[PDB]
Amino acid sequence: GSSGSSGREEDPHEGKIWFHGKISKQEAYNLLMTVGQVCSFLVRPSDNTPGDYSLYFRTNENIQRFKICPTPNNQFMMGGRYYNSIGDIIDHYRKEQIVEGYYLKEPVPMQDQSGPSSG
């Protein structure tokens, strides 16, 4: 007895509002400038490198880009740091400026193409 379904399912990580996967690297840029704004960041799965991650922060000056390499201790590394998990890294930065003088206010909202609004 199958006692369950299979085929079309959704992941929890892909449900985060700060997470971004549907978009691309180039889009993310123009996104943080349109859909986002100063004091706004977003996480995206490293394309060129299937297994890593990269943070994209937006500052009045310009858009930056951090590197988050995976660790053999089920954790993530950011700027020579070590946190339990991504979600945490953020909650932490919310207390300790991530830049020389910037703090994480709110991440970038995800776009839901699905909708009646058509040409």
UniProtKB/Swiss-Prot annotation:
Outcome (variant: R65L): In basal cell carcinomas
Reported function: Inhibitory regulator of the Ras-cyclic AMP pathway. Stimulates the GTPase of normal but not oncogenic Ras p21; this stimulation may be further increased in the presence of NCK1.
Tissue and organ distribution: In placental villi, detected only in the trophoblast layer (cytotrophoblast and syncytiotrophoblast). Not detected in stromal, endothelial or Hofbauer cells (at protein level).
Gene name of the record: RASA1
Associated disease: Mutations in the SH2 domain of RASA seem to be oncogenic and cause basal cell carcinomas.
Listed name of the protein: Ras GTPase-activating protein 1
Subcellular location: Cytoplasm
Signal peptide extent: none
Residue intervals of the SH2 domain: 18-108
Species of provenance: Homo sapiens (Human)
